[PDB]
Amino acid sequence: RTFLPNGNYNIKSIFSGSLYLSPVSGSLTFSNESSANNQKWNVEYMAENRCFKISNVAEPNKYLSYDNFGFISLDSLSNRCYWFPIKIAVNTYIMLSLNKVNELDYAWDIYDTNENILSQPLLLLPNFDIYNSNQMFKLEK
Amino acid sequence: NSLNDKIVTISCKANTDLFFYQVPGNGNVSLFQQTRNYLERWRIIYDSNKAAYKIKSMNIYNTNLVLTWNAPTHNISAQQDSNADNQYWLLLKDIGNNSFIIASYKNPNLVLYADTVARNLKLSTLNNSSYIKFIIEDYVISDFKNFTCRISPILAGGKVVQQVSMTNLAVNLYIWNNDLNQKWTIIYNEEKAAYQFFNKILSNGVLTWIFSDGNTVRVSSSAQNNDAQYWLINPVSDNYDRYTITNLRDKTKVLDLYGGQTADGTTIQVFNSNGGDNQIWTMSNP
Amino acid sequence: NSLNDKIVTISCKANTDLFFYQVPGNGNVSLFQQTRNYLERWRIIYDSNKAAYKIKSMNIYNTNLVLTWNAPTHNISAQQDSNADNQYWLLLKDIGNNSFIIASYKNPNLVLYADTVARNLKLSTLNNSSYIKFIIEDYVISDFKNFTCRISPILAGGKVVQQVSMTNLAVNLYIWNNDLNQKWTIIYNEEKAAYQFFNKILSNGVLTWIFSDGNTVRVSSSAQNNDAQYWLINPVSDNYDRYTITNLRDKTKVLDLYGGQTADGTTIQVFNSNGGDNQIWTMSNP
Incomplete structure (x- = not known):
């Protein structure tokens, strides 16, 4: 409780309000608010792994995960679908994958040409500190 | 760039x-x-x-x-x-x-x-x-x-550039009967920066100009270097895919049709580069 | 590789x-x-x-x-x-x-x-x-x-290769006074794959092997593509940051001190490439 309570969230980049996490042709990308269930993520603390899993409300047997190419993915449940969030300011988090890649952590990251992310896929890339703008994502309601 | x-x-x-x-x-x-x-x-x-x-x-x-x-x-x-x-x-x-x-x-x-x-x-x-x-x-x-292939002049094809026999080499123009003496294996050499034209009918035997004969062309076993041997292929951009076979020993020496005679037997020679047409040729799959 | x-x-x-x-x-x-x-x-x-x-x-x-x-x-x-x-x-x-x-x-x-x-x-x-x-x-x-620098033989680090003055364009050895005729600027022309040596009391005055009265050497207006101007700088590779200055026109003609002569006014010429000391130099900041 208090900290990321189970429920239905929206997921943005700090690079722009007015854009939401959504799946498209099987990638995850930030897109224009559609007020629909495609953009609503159900996030569930699983106390057995002290980590959280995140399902897509409109296809809720599919969870956020990643592939052996860089990308974050929607997939059926897997240990990869487990995430270990770090809050660093109201509603903003740096999502680390629970299980470490080599000796170093990875995170959701998203590229910006100039604080612009329009057509960009969400990927999984090494993390280091709390100071990477791209690694930062905000989860509301 | x-x-x-x-x-x-x-x-x-x-x-x-x-x-x-x-x-x-x-x-x-x-x-x-x-x-x-x-x-x-x-x-x-x-x-x-x-x-x-x-x-x-x-x-x-x-x-x-x-x-x-x-x-x-x-x-x-x-x-x-x-x-x-x-x-x-x-x-x-x-x-x-x-x-x-x-x-x-x-x-x-x-x-x-x-x-x-x-x-x-x-x-x-x-x-x-x-x-x-x-x-x-x-x-x-x-x-x-x-690329193992046949070579045909820009002038009407298929008549293919061939060596006369396994027994006898030289080099003539003919109508395409499939006999492998008309099938011709071309392979690049990075070091020299040029391509040799092997015959199939007997491998190790490659297409060569000659010295003490300038126009005449024939086939011979590969030798050091050898300068006479080897060739430079160069397209002519357009819808194209028609190439220009030029000898390394003398860059002005291009594979020529001897007046572009269009009939069986014709000698294949080698000339200065004014052409253009007997000099030109295309190459394709058996 | x-x-x-x-x-x-x-x-x-x-x-x-x-x-x-x-x-x-x-x-x-x-x-x-x-x-x-x-x-x-x-x-x-x-x-x-x-x-x-x-x-x-x-x-x-x-x-x-x-x-x-x-x-x-x-x-x-x-x-x-x-x-x-x-x-x-x-x-x-x-x-x-x-x-x-x-x-x-x-x-x-x-x-x-x-x-x-x-x-x-x-x-x-x-x-x-x-x-x-x-x-x-x-x-x-x-x-x-x-590289704006001073050039010195290894036989006399405190002494320096120089143009003699703004008017007198010959090149001798001299004790280092911080005067411009003693400072050079070294420039790579990469297309030429060789360096030139620009003297600092002259704009486009460049170290030259004047091939005609050669083995003598002096400074000349840069001109175009003389090819006796331009030099290669090779170390004696294992140790010491010491470089032979070889000339472009002739591979086996390098910068020379003319006997280990060491004394003010000693000539800098260009000579057959022998063992060294005579032939070795050292470049360094003013």
Whole structure:
């Protein structure tokens, strides 16, 4: 409780309000608010792994995960679908994958040409500190 | 810009026989067997301000189509040239294995990846595998590095340039009976920077000019160097695919038709380069 | 191969004046202004099967220490060599400008990145920013690319090769007074693959082997493409930063002191390439 309570969230980049996490042709990308269930993520603390899993409300047997190419993915449940969030300011988090890649952590990251992310896929890339703008994502309601 | 504006075949490092090839009906790019065809070819365009290249297909009935990572998906396709960020690429020579990583200007964390199973192109993040590494090479030296073929004059074909017999060499023009003395294996030599023309009827036997005879041409066993042996193939850009076989010993010496006689028996000779037409020739699959 | 066993300076494309530097008291690496000292030299070792290169600092005191990605941090240091995966690097050359993005063999996902606020080296994921891109060069070309300096034989370090005055354009040896006729500027013409020596009391007055009265040598207006102006600078490679100055026109004619003569006014000529001392020189800041 208090900290990321189970429920239905929206997921943005700090690079722009007015854009939401959504799946498209099987990638995850930030897109224009559609007020629909495609953009609503159900996030569930699983106390057995002290980590959280995140399902897509409109296809809720599919969870956020990643592939052996860089990308974050929607997939059926897997240990990869487990995430270990770090809050660093109201509603903003740096999502680390629970299980470490080599000796170093990875995170959701998203590229910006100039604080612009329009057509960009969400990927999984090494993390280091709390100071990477791209690694930062905000989860509301 | 070192190779800028060049015409090129990209093949996969994880499969030497697979080429970037554009599929006629629409805009798929696919990894395909060797093809000696415009569809196999791509010219590279540098942009000084974007500091990066785009890759354009020489599809003749679909000009101005270029390699294009589709917005957020994993998919590489060919597209109408908006001339946008998704349509540019950084070319990165590996220097170790001498191949290229091709990374998207749009987001250069992601790189071209060869999906060998399902024979199309995809994106992946950087790693050491050979799925992200690629061979880029001069369309001509690719089409001719090891091509076993027949040669026909620009003047009406098929009459093919052949050696007369396994027993007797020389070199004549004839109508295409399939006898392998008319089948002709051309193989590139990086060091010399030129191609030899082997005969099949007996390998080790290669197409040669002669010394103390200038016009005359024949076949002989390979020798050091040898300067007389070896040749330079050069296209004549247009709808084209018609080439010009030029000797290394004397660069003004081009393979000639001896007045372009169009009948069986004719000597094949070698001349100065004014041509043009007996000098010109095309080459193709048995 | 290509850059194997070669010996090199790395400078940041984001800021040309800062180079990779191995701070001498124990192992760190800093981005630091141009030195011309072993400190900013790095030997490039290839591992043909590892697929990738490692970069070894040339510090005399602590040889066999290389450039090395620290653990799960983003920092980068000079450390003892043990062929560990941290210690290798992919040298991916951008073909647009002739830059290099240098990626970790242990983890390509991220490549090294010039900090330049903290004069420092870290690892970051990729981008189009010039902070991840770098300039790799033969140290000799980097040292004598463009170098305002004084030239001295090894037989007399306190004495200096000079033009005699602004009017009298001959070249002798003289004790170092900080006067302009004693200072030169060395420039690489890369297309020519050789350097010229510009004297500093003259604009475009250049060290020349005047081939006609030769072996004598003096300064002349630069002219165009004389080819007796222009010189190669080769070290005596194992040790001491001492260079033979060989002439372009004639391979076996180098800069010469004319007997180990050492005394004010002694001639500087150009002579047959023998053992040395006579033939060796040393370049250094005014």
